[PDB]
């Protein structure tokens, strides 16, 4: 183990994790481009939202200027969670923020949707997870795209981020994105930093991307 316990999470942090992974809508677009920037580790997509009530622009945060350079001016696809609190950079009051979630558009379409096999163990006992739970059309997919989908299932099925009072029985948990061609990426399900979206989502700022072709996800949940 030696993972964070949900009881170590404070007041609003648990509620906001449920907000992010269960209630909020996700930014999901194909074929966008921009060379606009706010700070040098960001890329500003002016007019990203066309139907949104409150928002207009999307400011994407990356780990460094080096990562920005790989996407700036190129045609890209986006899939990620965004927040409006403590966000600014474009149109005043109508700017939404996101960490990573950007992949190159050209030659990344798979002929058919790839269904990512999920292996799940609740207190050692294996549980069957439907194959259409986590899926993608990208050859190189951000871990964020996959994580958002997996955690929603965990919410629906296990009330992952509900307080104990509300049948939230899982206390510790881990998600592992196992690829055959590189080392695993694994997140502690209760290891987010802070209480708000602006800090809880920083885990995706590295824009970690993985080959979806022949990989799987392992999820280990514990009720104590
Ligand atoms: Zn595995």
From Swiss-Prot:
Alphabetic keyword roster: Disulfide bond, Enterotoxin, Metal-binding, Secreted, Signal, Superantigen, Toxin, Zinc
Gene3D superfamilies named among the record's database cross-references: 2.40.50.110, 3.10.20.120
Cofactor: Zn(2+)
Cellular component GO terms held in the UniProt record: extracellular region
InterPro entries hit by this protein: Enterotoxin, Staph/Strept_toxin_CS, Staph_tox_OB, SuperAg_toxin_C, Superantigen_bac, Toxin_b-grasp_Staph/Strep, Toxin_bac
Annotated S-S bridges: 87-97
Single GO molecular function: metal ion binding
Extra facts: This toxin seems to be coded by a bacteriophage.
Family that this chain belongs to: Belongs to the staphylococcal/streptococcal toxin family.
Role summary: Staphylococcal enterotoxin that activates the host immune system by binding as unprocessed molecules to major histocompatibility (MHC) complex class II and T-cell receptor (TCR) molecules. In turn, waves of cellular activation, cytokine production, and migration into the lung tissue and airways occur via alphabeta T-cells. Also causes the intoxication staphylococcal food poisoning syndrome. The illness is characterized by high fever, hypotension, diarrhea, shock, and in some cases death.
Name this polypeptide is given: Enterotoxin type A
Gene: entA
């Amino acid at each position: 183990k030696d993972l964070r316990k949900k009881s170590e999470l404070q007041g609003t942090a648990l509620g906001n994790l449920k907000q992010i992974y269960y209630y909020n809508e996700k930014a999901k677009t194909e074929n966008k481009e921009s060379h606009d920037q706010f700070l040098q580790h960001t890329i500003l997509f002016k007019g990203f939202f066309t139907d949104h009530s409150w928002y207009n622009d999307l400011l994407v945060d990356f780990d460094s200027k080096d990562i920005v350079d790989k996407y700036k001016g190129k045609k890209v696809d986006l899939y990620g969670a965004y927040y409006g609190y403590q966000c600014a950079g474009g149109t005043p009051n109508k700017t939404a923020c996101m960490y990573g979630g950007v992949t190159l558009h050209d030659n990344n379409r798979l002929t058919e949707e790839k269904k990512v096999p999920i292996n799940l163990w609740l207190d050692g006992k294996q549980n069957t997870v439907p194959l259409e739970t986590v899926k993608t059309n990208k050859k190189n997919v951000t871990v964020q795209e996959l994580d958002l989908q997996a955690r929603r299932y965990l919410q629906e099925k296990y009330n992952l981020y509900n307080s104990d009072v509300f049948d939230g029985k899982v206390q510790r948990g881990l998600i592992v994105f196992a690829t055959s061609t590189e080392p695993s990426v694994n997140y502690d399900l209760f290891g987010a930093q802070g209480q708000y979206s602006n800090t809880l989502l920083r885990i995706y700022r590295d824009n970690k991307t993985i080959n979806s072709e022949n990989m799987h996800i392992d999820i280990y949940l514990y009720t104590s």
